[PDB]
Homo-oligomer: A and B are copies of this chain.
Amino acid sequence: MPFLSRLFHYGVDLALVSTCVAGIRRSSGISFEVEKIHNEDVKTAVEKYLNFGEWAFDQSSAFLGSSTWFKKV
């Protein structure tokens, strides 16, 4: 559970990019092909970046859902 330190590590714009990429996978099934990265340590780093977006997507949906300005349809 380092996800918050990684928000500051990646920065706002790259954190938002990863969160968008996760949102794309969730509704369309379009997913980065992590198994086509040759080097293992790079695959681990890429997966860390993408997995942060997945976590951030879940945290962001929960936060917006906590506001009376949003509703679940």
Contact = CB atoms under 8 A, between A and B. Distances in A.
Interface of A: 1-5, 7-14, 16-17, 19-33, 36, 39, 41-42, 44-46, 49, 57, 60-61, 63-73
Helix, strand, loop or mixed for chain A's interface?
Answer: helix
B14 A14 contact: no
B72 A29 contact: yes
8 contacts: A2-B41, A19-B23, A20-B20, A28-B65, A31-B73, A32-B64, A36-B69, A66-B67
Contacts of A1: 39, 41-42, 45
Given A1-B45, A20-B20, 9 more contacts: A1-B41, A2-B42, A4-B41, A5-B9, A5-B45, A8-B14, A23-B24, A36-B69, A67-B67
